[PDB]
């Protein structure tokens, strides 16, 4: 029975529905499930005031404000501020009850409902760890994790040290193997394999030991990219099998400890570091008290054997033939199978929802593609035309918004355009027509337009199941230019800057060179373009190789005439900046020489900033720890006081504006500074 030892079951158990139902309801020890439940509840309680935004609710949902919001459905609307505070209080109470084990099911539902309401409220706050938290809560709702180490067993002698069915562990293990597998099968994209996604991450001081035997570019290519891909692909297989459990445990622990320091992703690292002992035997907490001293073995509950439970089906050779499974067992097995199948299918569902497919497939948040695509934005321009007088005006990019993610998605752009159309008449404007002009470069590519600048987005057509028509395709046959682009960028001085631009045929770019931008020029790399000077009306044609100098403080237009896309570049110098720095350096040198035998203020304040940085470097870590603890305490206290204020207002009523001002001023006292 080698396969029976490797997998824990036999092939004959899967030959019938009855046998599978019996196998999936096998009795199991509940200790690991209890430990994971406690840790997850504690982490959620710590996370609610920080990342979910309980300490910024007054700023975000201030009553009577002109804000554009981006919900998944426009039928979903937020409530007043006090009801937001009530919803967050209910979610916090549910998380606390889930952690303690007191009223497990009610607390699970109380955490689950408002969390998903808040999640669906805004599309601009979706990431992968929030989705994972929602999924874990949904799974834990249907399990019985209060059968060990819980308050629910103290006031009920029927759920204390009882068996649990096997699928309770199978569902969680299957989930943690989809995170790591579907995350390294998405890192088999040419930009991750070639080493373009995270090129500057190897400069961290945590990678210094690797530099003793590898070069910097080799460290970036091998350790960061290929090592990460291999770990993601093989972690689940390493953890599942007991022959290689220790090595896999050490590797994933080191990986998550590194990721907790490199990035700022909330509690993702700590959550996935507590979900890896759910692959070890379900009795590890029971065995871990046998190594602690026997002096401390008396205050903990006596380690007895688990007591029978009605949740799991019992099949014994001598202990009767067995009972026919009821509805509970069949429902559990069906839930396990269907949930795992749907979780496998969902990340590859992008061929159905074609309306959410931009340059990158789908909405961000549920596909397990972390740190693969990076974006850089060069210029954003919003222009509206009055529908009555025909006047042309320009709006400040991102006026009534609280995020910046609307620049990459067509649905968010449509929502923003509709919000602006509804809000503009309040500022003495008739019905507007709004056009957008956004330049984006993805993974160190040429900058190009992502949306058509000739299309009025207010009257455009968008559907969830239809491919958008006004989205410009990514110029994929220009990536092999990146080596030459990097060489050109490196072969520069300490004062010049370079911008790379690729333009579609039939469109033109209008630019206004600032006064301080003396000595600016345009050089053509491919195709053919014509440059027109607005002041002195004349066209000039360019060929591959030549360059032309442009004046300062004047409008110039670049027209693309080649049948194929053409690319050029900009070289400009800040004459005022270099003159200021050179005169500052000359004056500082002269003053230093004189002493030893507002520009000065700027130099002195920069020196003061450098001195503060070096003093913080020299000082030990305990002051930093004290400051970090003080900031966390301040945020917790502020959230608690505002929640109490809003709860009092809801229960009794608004006392007076003066008292409200006094309590609000009290709530931001900064306890110790």
């Amino acid at each position: 029975s080698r396969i029976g030892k490797l997998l824990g079951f036999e092939w004959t158990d899967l030959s019938s529905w009855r046998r599978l139902v019996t196998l999936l309801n096998r009795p199991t020890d509940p200790a690991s499930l209890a430990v994971f439940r406690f840790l997850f509840g504690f982490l959620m309680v710590l996370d609610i005031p920080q990342e979910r935004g309980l300490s910024s609710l007054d700023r975000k949902y201030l009553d009577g404000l002109d804000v554009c919001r981006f919900p998944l459905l426009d039928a979903l609307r937020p409530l007043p501020l006090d009801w937001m505070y009530l919803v967050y209080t209910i979610m916090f109470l549910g998380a606390l009850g889930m952690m303690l084990g007191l009223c497990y099911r009610i607390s699970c539902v109380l955490f689950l409902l408002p969390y998903w309401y808040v999640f669906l409220l805004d599309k601009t706050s979706w990431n992968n760890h929030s989705y994972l938290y929602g999924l874990l809560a949904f799974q834990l709702t249907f399990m019985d994790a209060n059968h060990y180490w819980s308050v629910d067993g103290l006031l009920n002698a029927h759920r204390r040290n009882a068996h649990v069915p096997l699928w309770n562990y199978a569902v969680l293990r299957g989930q943690i193997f989809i995170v790591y597998f579907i995350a390294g099968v998405k890192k088999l994209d040419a930009d991750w394999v070639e080493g373009y996604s995270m090129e500057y991450l190897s400069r961290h001081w945590l990678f210094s030991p690797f530099k003793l035997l590898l070069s910097e570019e080799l460290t970036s290519l091998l350790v960061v990219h290929w090592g990460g891909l291999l770990l993601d692909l093989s972690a689940g297989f390493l953890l599942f099998f007991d022959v290689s459990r220790s090595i896999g445990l050490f590797f994933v622990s080191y990986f998550h400890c590194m990721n907790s320091q490199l990035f700022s992703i909330g509690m993702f690292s700590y959550v996935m570091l507590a979900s890896s002992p759910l692959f070890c035997s379900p009795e590890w907490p029971r065995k871990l008290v046998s190594y602690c001293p026997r002096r401390l073995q008396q205050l903990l509950p006596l380690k007895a054997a688990p007591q029978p439970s009605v949740s799991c089906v019992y099949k014994r050779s001598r202990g009767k033939s067995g009972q026919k499974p009821g509805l509970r067992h069949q429902l559990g097995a069906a839930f396990t199978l269907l949930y795992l199948l749907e979780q496998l299918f969902l990340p590859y569902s992008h061929f159905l929802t074609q309306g959410y497919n931009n340059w990158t497939n789908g909405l961000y948040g549920y596909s397990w593609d972390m740190m693969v695509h990076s974006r850089s934005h060069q210029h954003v321009k919003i222009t509206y035309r009055d529908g009555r007088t025909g006047e042309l005006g320009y709006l400040n990019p991102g006026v009534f918004t609280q995020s910046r993610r609307w620049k990459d998605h067509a649905d968010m752009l449509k929502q923003y355009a509709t919000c602006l159309s509804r809000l503009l008449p309040k500022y003495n404007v008739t019905e507007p027509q709004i056009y957008f002009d956004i330049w984006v470069s993805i993974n160190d590519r040429f900058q190009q337009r992502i949306f058509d600048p000739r299309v009025d987005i207010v009257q455009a057509a968008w559907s969830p199941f239809q491919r958008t028509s006004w989205v410009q395709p990514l110029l994929m046959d220009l990536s092999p230019w990146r080596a030459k682009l990097q060489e050109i960028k490196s072969s520069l001085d300490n004062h010049t800057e370079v911008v790379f631009i690729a333009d579609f045929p039939g469109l033109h770019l209008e630019n206004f060179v600032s006064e301080d931008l003396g000595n600016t020029s345009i050089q053509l790399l491919q195709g053919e373009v014509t440059v027109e000077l607005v002041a002195e009306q004349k066209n000039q044609t360019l060929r591959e190789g030549e360059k032309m100098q442009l004046p300062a403080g004047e409008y110039h237009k670049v027209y693309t005439t080649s049948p194929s896309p053409s690319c050029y570049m900009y070289v400009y110098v800040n004459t005022t900046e270099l003159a200021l720095e050179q005169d500052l350096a000359y004056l500082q040198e002269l003053k230093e020489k004189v002493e030893n035998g507002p520009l000065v203020q700027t130099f002195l304040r920069r020196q003061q900033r450098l001195q503060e940085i070096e003093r913080r470097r020299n000082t030990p870590f305990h002051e930093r720890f004290f400051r970090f603890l003080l900031r966390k305490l301040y945020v917790f206290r502020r959230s608690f006081l505002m929640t109490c204020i809003s709860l009092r207002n809801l229960i009794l009523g608004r006392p007076s504006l003066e008292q409200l001002a006094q309590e609000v001023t009290y709530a931001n006292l900064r306890p110790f500074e």
Binding site: E51, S125, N127, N128, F263, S264, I265, G266, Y364, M370, M371, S374, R375, S376, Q378, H379, K381, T383, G393, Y394, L395, N396, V399, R405, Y427, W439, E497, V499, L509, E510, N511, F512, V513, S514, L517, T520, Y555, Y570, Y572
Partner: peptide, 21 residues
């Protein structure tokens, strides 16, 4: 405080990941 002019709007010559909060 939400309107620009042609001069400031047309100035072109002046990386991030969506997982970090």
């Amino acid at each position: 405080a939400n309107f620009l002019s042609k001069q400031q709007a047309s100035q072109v010559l002046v990386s991030a990941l969506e997982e970090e909060v």
